[PDB]
Amino acid sequence: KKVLLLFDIDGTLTPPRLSQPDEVREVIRRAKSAGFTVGTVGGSDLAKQIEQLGEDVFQQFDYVFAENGLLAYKHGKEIHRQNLLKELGNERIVKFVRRALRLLSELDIPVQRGTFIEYRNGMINVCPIGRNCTQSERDEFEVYDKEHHVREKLIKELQNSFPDYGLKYSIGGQISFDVFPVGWDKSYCLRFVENDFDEIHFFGDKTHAGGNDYEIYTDKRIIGHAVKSYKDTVDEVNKLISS
Amino acid sequence: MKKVLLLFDIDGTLTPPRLSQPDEVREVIRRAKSAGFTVGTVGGSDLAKQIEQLGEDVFQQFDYVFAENGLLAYKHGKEIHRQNLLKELGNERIVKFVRRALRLLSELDIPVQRGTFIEYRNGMINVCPIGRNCTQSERDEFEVYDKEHHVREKLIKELQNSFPDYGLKYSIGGQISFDVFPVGWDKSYCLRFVENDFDEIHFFGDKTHAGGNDYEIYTDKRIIGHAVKSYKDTVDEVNKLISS
Ligand SMILES: [Mg+2]
Numbered sequence: 001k002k003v004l005l006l007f008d009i010d011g012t013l014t015p016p017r018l019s020q021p022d023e024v025r026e027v028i029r030r031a032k033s034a035g036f037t038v039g040t041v042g043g044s045d046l047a048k049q050i051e052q053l054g055e056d057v058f059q060q061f062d063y064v065f066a067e068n069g070l071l072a073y074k075h076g077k078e079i080h081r082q083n084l085l086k087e088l089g090n091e092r093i094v095k096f097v098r099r100a101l102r103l104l105s106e107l108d109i110p111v112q113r114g115t116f117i118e119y120r121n122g123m124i125n126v127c128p129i130g131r132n133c134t135q136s137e138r139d140e141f142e143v144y145d146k147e148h149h150v151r152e153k154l155i156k157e158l159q160n161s162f163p164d165y166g167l168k169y170s171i172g173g174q175i176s177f178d179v180f181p182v183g184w185d186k187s188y189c190l191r192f193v194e195n196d197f198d199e200i201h202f203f204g205d206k207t208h209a210g211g212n213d214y215e216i217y218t219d220k221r222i223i224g225h226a227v228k229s230y231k232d233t234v235d236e237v238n239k240l241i242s243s
Numbered sequence: 244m245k246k247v248l249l250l251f252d253i254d255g256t257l258t259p260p261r262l263s264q265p266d267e268v269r270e271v272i273r274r275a276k277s278a279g280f281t282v283g284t285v286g287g288s289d290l291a292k293q294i295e296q297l298g299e300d301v302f303q304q305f306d307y308v309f310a311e312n313g314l315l316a317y318k319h320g321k322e323i324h325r326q327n328l329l330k331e332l333g334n335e336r337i338v339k340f341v342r343r344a345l346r347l348l349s350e351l352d353i354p355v356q357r358g359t360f361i362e363y364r365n366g367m368i369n370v371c372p373i374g375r376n377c378t379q380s381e382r383d384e385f386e387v388y389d390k391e392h393h394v395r396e397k398l399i400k401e402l403q404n405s406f407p408d409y410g411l412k413y414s415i416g417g418q419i420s421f422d423v424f425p426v427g428w429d430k431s432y433c434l435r436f437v438e439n440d441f442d443e444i445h446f447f448g449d450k451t452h453a454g455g456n457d458y459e460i461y462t463d464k465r466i467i468g469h470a471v472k473s474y475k476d477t478v479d480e481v482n483k484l485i486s487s
Pocket residue numbers: 008009010011012205206
């Protein structure tokens with residue numbers, strides 16, 4: 001019997017915006033000893049998972065899915081690296097990024113720095129303040145955006161400009177939003193595991209419709225566990241270990 | 244008895260164009276240190292680029308490592324200086340600058356654009372019309388395109404027209420980008436950290452002509468300048484100094 005346990009990271013394996021607690025490391029160690037395969041699926045880049053989970057994340061987890069699985073590792077080896085260009089084509093990319101640049105130039109937010117548009121493997125990250133800002137400026141913009149809805153207004157303008165582009169808009173991050181082809185949500189990673197496991201369990205804190213765990217949670221191929229915190233994840237994994 | 248410093252540009256000085264340090268250059272720098280020279284690098288790009296070009300042991304290879312023109316400075320792998328653009332320009336000017344850059348990038352008609360157009364570094368802003376997130380092929384294609392269509396040079400003209408009072412220098416240093424930084428924060432900036440510690444300072448670089456990102460340091464009166472065309476000429480010129 002082969003059972004895969006897939007975890008969202010922020011809010012599932014960690015307190016919000018902090019690092020993996022000892023209780024989480026303990027339960028993952030104990031799940032692997034029982035013979036569970038374990039994997040992470042985040043919407044961020046790998047560097048962000050190293051920051052939340054630690055430098056040895058490739059040893060802790062059998063599977064590390066970065067960018068929703070568009071960048072995939074098994075036992076620290078790259079098994080997949082998607083590219084957006086083959087899905088959208090150059091003309092649509094260039095029109096999209098030119099409209100995003102114009103919209104970011106029209107903002108009246110108090111702080112802007114750099115790295116507004118990050119072209120990753122199979123997604124574009126749009127960050128209104130720019131990813132090159134300080135921690136203090138990042139935390140400030142998070143609060144600003146709850147009052148002024150900067151990301152939500154930009155998404156609405158991009159939806160209005162590009163109705164038939166085949167893009168999903170996902171406010172995943174603290175100060176940014178993700179743009180990727182329809183179907184390249186976190187359920188994307190299931191193409192690498194669907195044929196290799198009897199059961200796949202998914203654990204995540206953002207499993208409501210609109211949350212970046214909804215598609216993987218509701219995929220017919222997985223057993224979903226909605227968790228409110230890492231304490232719920234530990235309780236749920238402990239139940240599965242019992243068997 | 245004299246203290247001598249040898250300062251090297253990196254791309255086209257320590258490396259073949261756009262490629263990494265050859266073992267031969269590694270050898271000549273070792274031989275210069277053995278002969279009693281202090282050696283340093285002065286790059287216009289970030290530190291991570293220098294590590295790609297020179298290797299993970301760059302801080303052991305060179306006594307001084309000057310990245311972003313010396314706005315980020317290391318001596319024996321210890322940070323001695325990190326400049327901050329915000330204290331020079333203030334937030335209002337940075338925000339107006341980057342919004343005008345974004346507008347201008349949005350109005351381009353170039354065939355390929357991807358991402359990381361505007362990089363806010365320690366003491367400079369890097370503007371890349373195609374975006375730093377493009378492939379090697381796309382980067383090499385844009386270098387040729389820009390030689391014909393002068394995209395960077397026309398963006399610089401628009402930014403200069405928009406911001407006559409901002410006290411900025413515009414430097415076409417890279418393969419696909421240009422740098423923007425306060426006047427006086429060119430590669431000559433690094434000389435403040437060394438000018439009082441050396442009897443003689445030599446500079447080797449390939450872009451020592453007016454409009455080149457090595458021009459101001461090459462022509463500084465504190466400098467003995469050595470215009471080189473390739474890393475082969477750098478080996479030759481350092482060999483001459485070792486031989487006396
Ligand atoms: Mg989460």
